[PDB]
Write a protein that binds this ligand. Structure first.
Ligand code: HEC
Ligand code: HEC
Ligand code: HEC
Ligand code: HEC
Ligand SMILES: [Ca+2]
Ligand SMILES: [Ca+2]
Lengths: 131, 354, 376, 125, 376, 355
């Protein structure tokens, strides 16, 4: 509830904006419009593009690589909106930037933002953003 | 036991007595000094290898044996996607089933039959002892048992930590022992954010225990024919390499032109690239992915030829969903990717980078 | 007790611990069932709008459907599809109008039909469920037109094509009773029966006048197509019941939702969907509260439940929120749905005891319409 | 504030939902998006259709007929949303019905709802 | 103390008393002036959006413009017209995409040009004012494309036609300096100068790299076209100032928005449009607050004002609200516009004292971008 | 003075001696028993009136003089809309300017000149007394003065309560002295909610003190030529009634085909309808408006002939913005409008409603 405060990750509720994997999410958690943590809601299109973040996992003390992905081709869900920016870089460093509608590669050239999934792709370990 | 079996494999691996004219061994083509690939220049450069007879050329690039023991046995998964196996076209189930095939392939080691293989094993007093201690008395007198035992020893040899040491810079960085250079980390990031990681990763999500930069699936990325290699192979200008569809039992036309996703470990030192060795440079292999994404006039052109890549040898079943990612790799990102890929070189092959 | 986002966090941590892999993909929504509920958000006349597909049992959003200007949603009672009649413009809210009908698969939510309606013929009005209607066989969509005159449009969903506009008398709403027949409520206090073909003047009959010029019948009557029951409250909570199950209108005994003392004390119905009807229970639910007579579109905090046969009161539920629209699931032990346009929240109640069980919030900007499928 | 209470008109603020002329308005007060009490905002189109109410004017003790009119061809303004229903009848008495998008007659076939104006057209009889 | 709604009631009451007639018409917006301000609502990635035209003096909404998905607003510095690059789909958020430029007359708010952009070339991103840009002569509009690669679209407003895509290196944003020239910011830390004739490649020059790999520059630099001043804050409030008024990039001294102590105390810039630049006063305004290093997009409660020439702090205002974007009118005794995404309110401050004068609420769903015209 | 001038006008109004053959007075065509309209049959029915020579027919329907004194003098406002005046094309500024015209019109009263009008007035000792009392001695000796004075007397008489009594049922209802029937009240609500009020209400907004159901503007509603009236008048098959454009000093081609919005008071008793008396029935004038709104085939048909309304006499400058309201009038609303319009009948003419 204090927006300026250092963000504190939890591992108890994926729908809340302080869930550990959402550390650099922008938009809406797919789990609130009929997707899940790591799947898209029906009728949307999963982008193949991602932006990536190292998110510290409070539970095991390990930092994980979250390759966020957009579900596209719907109007914005309006449910569970969240904006976090852990390690988020400006647009000229796009691989870490989250204002971008990362809908590239989606089926049917879907390019509207509905919501974002938060799957783990590895265990790193950045430089601009390490634990 | 598994120790002894692997030690017998180690002997068999370098023994040219497993070829018709006794001029080549597994090691001739899968040279330990070149990440288990062929350094020998032939009619078609390093694209394809030359068999025991000193003239016969294959139609495919000789792949590394490093990490090949990490590939699952051939199977079709629940999404209906084929995964694993050995050879570029997955025509062998596992390392054991594969081993015997070069020994009896007339364009390679060219032994006429299993009998002739067993006969050469019987010539060597050290093989009588080695084999008989692991498989029992008179194993070498039975061509089937001998051939199978040899293949098994070879498979076990290939599963030793020696073929898969996991001691690349990447391995050490993921152990926290050291760090990626800025360019390497960018390469890594690029690799997992652009389309690469959709095929060159063990898993779709989570953390891979022993990552080998392949999901073991089959894709047609729409490569053209390698003219000289194809000419050298003598299979004809009519010939089409149908990849996986060539595996006996595969009848599905959607698999035509599909090839196993190679492990990218030691990729930096096992040029030339792809199933037909068509690209000499690693940078070219990377560049080739831009033809599906970039609208720049240079995306259509192979830098090694200065001419259009060429039509797909197999025009259909292209993985367009994955390849048409609507994002181009600029020079900087290709540089980054080359850097990252070089970090997948094993300790012992780090001298070979220059 | 544990929230869905809690359970999900727990499950996700267990998968990570056990090195479990899963392919990120497009989910299917769970099979439609009796406790699926659709909430439409006319968004207070916004040019684009949202429908939320909700599992009322879990109180979870299982999907969404995008729409244009004041769409009319419909839901096949058998569960096979949903569709809407919708309206878009080439430049957001200006330029070329396109009216169309979409049909959607209820599990993938993909459009399986996009049928253009020629000459922009949709009635544009705050959403009345019964201004667009499915015939019982699910093959025909009927939609009301106001301009230039009252008319009714026939859309063939099976052949995926617009059929024709039918000229009707000065009448309103469309309550289908058969593949070729529907009733409307007329200005003169009658119902009009309209039987139509592919071509030819429709057969239009009138019932007798069933109410005086000074009884005012609300815009959101409940109609159980399967029961052929039309439950039409007036401003006073007086309820007209018309039985259309014979194919012709039979006027049922009038019932009062509110007692005389209640009415003397200013109890009146109020909201949007003020009335719900449970078919198998033959129960009427009416949103009511103490209100001035010209506050008939404000929220109400109370639901009376009354036996449709006798008009006997079975319950008065204190809803505990500002409820604009009610509806019910049509299974046994029904859920009573209670949508607050103000809260943008669907409150899911046990219909027997009126107890609030769970709620689904963040449903758009001004959601107003609840639709359930009668599947059983 | 009490939504269910009898509506009490005022003649001192045209942007509040209790302004006397808005007694059966449904939508947004045009004055809040660049219109005025009786004019459309720029870029929208004035409907010729209308619906009427007899609204009591507490300034002069007279009821007046207010023939509402929609400004059309814009997405809903989202400012000064209001909804009142003095004498509002169900849709089958469209002269007095206010869920309807009364954009008929608007230039360029504009039929989207943006806001509503509140002109007097006569005394109430 | 009389509000605009009250004065309006009094005037209306007086016209009625006096028997004054007046024709219900379409109002014209007041001629554009220095105090006119536009607020764009990207509506948190909603498929359609709104621009609010505001008279900053009266704090009155004088008109509105509808937009599509994440449109880029531009406003001709001289007041002759506004325009935007927008994006619509044939079915709300799905189907065939059309990217287009509209140009609007600033008093009728009527579109005077509607120009289709071929092959859906717009960069779709949370709104950055300098991803789409007017040349100083108002004749040309330049928009950024990111996919398949960084590129810049040339749109001929005079001829009302799209011209062509320009190749650029790995660079971002567009800052026009001439009828045929604009600068971009590149990944390698340099700026690329792009000069484009009528055919073939543009001529791309790079500047010296002017910041290191680890010094992060914000997505919303202030750029005054008439000054040629590019004002670029970093995540730490270090401000790069690049003069472009000779045609080439002179790098002004680097300056610090925050003191060494403040930065040690956790003071950082944060928000959306975190920086404003007054051209006549040669002054910089920066939205700052105490925050964690990775809370750079959260609202800020403070604005600091510094002389662009020296770097001296001129004032620090406690804004009294959660502000996400700021901008200034470009007249004398300018207003400081402070937009709260959260409140959906434009708070209008006196830029001298930082005092709140008036506010305009209900500006959409999540308004973020303020544009003004530099009419001086 | 005010009463005397009116009283002189009353004498002149009924005096046939202002016509060449002395057969015709204002009251002849503007018959006080029929709301000041012409009950006589001509070659074109009641559509056009027959002059003093007993042969000559006009080309326009003779309008009521009831409430005509409520029309402002002809003018153009800031809108650029012309408003007011007298005659269907508003070619006379006002009542006084209008009065002299029927007198000297060869197709009407047909006096050769002003001198001949004076002569007639000079012959009557009651006029010498009456005129001289109001305008001075020897007024009748001066043709210009005598002619102008008559026009003024005639104007003043038309300004009396006699001509605009405001004692219709409508007026009674608006004073609260009675109530509309259900049909009349629906009629009224329709009139104010459908496009009628865009033209047939004095004001754009607010409340009119003396409503006469016209905004005094000029609109081309796209009426056809009245063939029989056009034949009777003898203006020719190629003649176009240009309406307001025919006013001297109006050059604006956009004014072609535009006619003054008639007052709707006494509309029920002053058939046939429109500038050329083309429609017989009140219902028919109302149904004419559906041609612009309704989709059905019958909207294009004149129910009195069974044939299309016909091509507008002037196909340009139609008030389509107003006329194309997007909403058709059903028969219920048409009945309602008739009933409402009948309430606009002055008290003394309510007996005429029956027939
Ligand atoms: C004449 C050169 C040559 C010799 C000798 C040779 N190979 Fe190969 N090896 C190849 C070529 C070429 C392929 C690819 C064939 C194909 O894809 O159809 C290959 C494929 C393989 C593979 C599959 C690797 C992968 O990623 O699919 C394994 C394992 C292998 N060889 C091991 C052996 C062993 C063990 C021996 C000794 C019995 C041996 N090879 C002898 C050239 C040779
Ligand atoms: C559609 C799945 C897919 C995608 C996406 C993909 N690859 Fe590949 N890659 C393959 C397959 C299959 C082959 C072998 C192709 C063949 O020879 O038929 C291959 C071959 C290669 C080789 C040659 C390796 C060798 O041993 O010969 C390199 C290097 C490579 N890929 C890197 C990349 C990079 C870097 C990216 C991201 C730009 C990428 N790939 C995208 C599947 C993919
Ligand atoms: C031949 C029959 C006839 C006689 C006699 C006649 N009128 Fe008329 N009156 C008409 C016709 C026909 C028109 C409309 C013609 C036109 O608009 O050009 C008309 C129009 C008028 C109008 C304009 C009314 C309106 O609403 O536009 C006035 C005023 C008028 N007459 C008054 C008089 C007076 C006063 C006299 C006696 C001096 C008189 N008329 C004599 C037939 C007659
Ligand atoms: C666009 C302006 C306009 C609108 C809207 C309009 N009228 Fe008229 N009306 C006229 C004009 C002008 C005339 C005279 C036409 C002519 O004779 O050339 C007229 C003539 C009439 C007449 C014949 C009167 C007479 O004395 O000859 C009747 C009756 C009438 N209108 C009724 C209506 C009704 C009912 C409506 C609403 C459905 C209506 N009007 C809407 C302008 C309008
Ligand atoms: Ca190779
Ligand atoms: Ca007449």
């Amino acid at each position: 509830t204090d927006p300026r405060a250092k963000w504190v990750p939890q591992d108890n509720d994926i729908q809340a904006c302080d869930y550990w994997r959402h550390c650099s999410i922008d938009g809406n958690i797919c789990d609130c419009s009929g997707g899940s943590l790591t799947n898209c809601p029906p009728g949307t299109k999963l982008a193949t593009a991602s932006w990536v973040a190292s998110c510290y996992n409070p539970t095991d003390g390990q930092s994980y690589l979250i390759a966020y992905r957009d579900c596209c081709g719907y109007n914005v869900s309006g449910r569970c909106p969240c904006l976090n920016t852990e390690g988020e870089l400006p647009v000229y460093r796009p691989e870490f930037a989250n204002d971008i509608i990362w809908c590239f590669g989606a089926e049917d050239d879907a390019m509207t933002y509905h919501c974002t999934i938060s799957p783990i792709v590895g265990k790193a370990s950045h430089h601009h953003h390490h634990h | 036991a598994d120790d002894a079996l692997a030690a017998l494999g180690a002997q068999l691996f370098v023994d040219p007595a497993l070829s018709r004219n006794a001029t080549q061994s597994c090691a001739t083509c899968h040279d330990p000094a070149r990440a288990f690939t062929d350094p020998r220049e032939g009619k078609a450069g390093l694209a394809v290898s030359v068999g025991d007879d000193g003239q016969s050329h294959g139609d495919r690039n000789t792949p590394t044996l490093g990490y090949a023991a990490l590939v699952p046995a051939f199977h079709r998964d629940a999404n209906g996607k084929y995964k694993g196996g050995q050879f570029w076209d997955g025509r062998a189930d596992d390392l054991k089933q594969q081993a015997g095939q070069p020994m009896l392939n007339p364009v390679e080691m060219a032994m006429p039959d299993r009998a002739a293989v067993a006969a050469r094993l019987r010539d060597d007093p050290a093989y009588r002892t080695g084999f008989e201690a692991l498989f029992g008395k008179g194993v070498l007198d039975d061509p089937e048992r001998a051939f199978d035992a040899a293949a098994e020893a070879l498979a076990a040899y290939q599963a030793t930590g020696e073929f898969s040491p996991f001691d690349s810079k990447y391995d050490r960085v993921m152990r926290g022992e050291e760090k990626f250079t800025p360019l390497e980390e960018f390469g890594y990031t690029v690799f997992i954010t652009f389309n690469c990681r959709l095929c060159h990763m063990q898993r779709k999500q989570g953390v891979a225990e022993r990552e080998t930069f392949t999901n073991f699936e089959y894709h047609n990325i729409g490569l053209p024919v390698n003219e000289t290699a194809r000419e050298a192979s003598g299979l004809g200008a009519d010939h089409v390499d149908h990849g996986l569809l060539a595996r006996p039992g595969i009848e599905d036309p959607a698999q035509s032109g599909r090839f196993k996703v190679p492990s990218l470990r030691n990729v930096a030192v096992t040029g030339p690239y792809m199933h037909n060795g068509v690209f000499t440079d690693l940078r070219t292999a990377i560049l080739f992915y831009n033809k599906y994404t970039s609208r720049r006039p240079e995306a259509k052109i192979n830098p090694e030829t200065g001419a259009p890549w060429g039509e797909p040898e197999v025009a259909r079943n292209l993985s367009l969903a994955e390849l048409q990612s609507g994002l181009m790799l600029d020079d900087g990102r290709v540089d980054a990717l080359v850097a990252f890929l070089e970090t997948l070189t094993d300790r012992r092959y780090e001298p070979l980078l220059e | 007790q544990e929230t869905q986002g809690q359970a999900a966090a727990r499950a996700a941590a267990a998968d990570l611990a056990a090195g479990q892999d899963d392919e990120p993909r497009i989910l299917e929504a769970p099979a439609p069932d009796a406790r699926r509920v659709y909430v439409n958000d006319p968004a207070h006349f916004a040019a684009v709008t949202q429908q939320f597909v909700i599992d009322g049992e879990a109180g979870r959003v299982i999907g969404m459907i995008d729409g244009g200007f004041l769409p009319n949603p419909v839901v096949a009672d058998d569960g096979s599809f949903i569709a809407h009649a919708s309206t878009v413009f080439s430049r957001i809210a200006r330029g070329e109008r396109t009216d169309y009908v979409e049909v959607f698969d209820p599990v993938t939510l993909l459009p399986t039909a996009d049928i253009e309606l020629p000459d922009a013929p949709r009635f544009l009005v705050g959403t009345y469920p019964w201004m667009t209607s499915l015939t019982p066989d699910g093959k025909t969509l009927l939609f009301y037109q106001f301009s230039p005159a009252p008319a009714v449009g026939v859309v063939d969903l099976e052949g995926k094509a617009f059929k024709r506009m039918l000229d009707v008398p000065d009448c309103y709403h469309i309550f289908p009773t058969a593949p070729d027949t529907f009733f409307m409520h007329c200005r003169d206090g009658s119902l009009a029966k309209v039987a139509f073909g592919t071509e030819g003047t429709p057969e239009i009959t009138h019932t007798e006048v069933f109410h005086p010029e000074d009884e005012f019948l609300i815009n959101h009557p409940a109609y159980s197509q399967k029961a052929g029951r039309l439950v039409w409250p007036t401003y006073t909570g007086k309820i007209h019941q018309i039985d259309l199950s014979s194919g012709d209108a039979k006027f049922l005994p009038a019932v009062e939702a509110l007692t005389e003392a209640e009415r003397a004390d200013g109890w009146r119905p109020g909201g949007w969907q003020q009335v719900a009807y449970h078919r198998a229970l033959d129960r009427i639910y009416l949103l009511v509260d103490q209100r001035d007579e010209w506050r008939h579109k404000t929220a109400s905090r109370f639901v009376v439940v009354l036996d449709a046969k006798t008009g006997e009161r079975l319950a008065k539920f204190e809803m505990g929120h500002e409820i604009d629209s009610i509806n019910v699931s049509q299974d046994e032990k029904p859920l009573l749905y209670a949508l607050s346009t103000g809260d943008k929240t669907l409150y899911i109640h046990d219909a027997e005891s009126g107890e609030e069980l769970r709620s689904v919030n963040q449903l758009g900007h001004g959601p107003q319409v609840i639709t359930t499928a009668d599947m059983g």
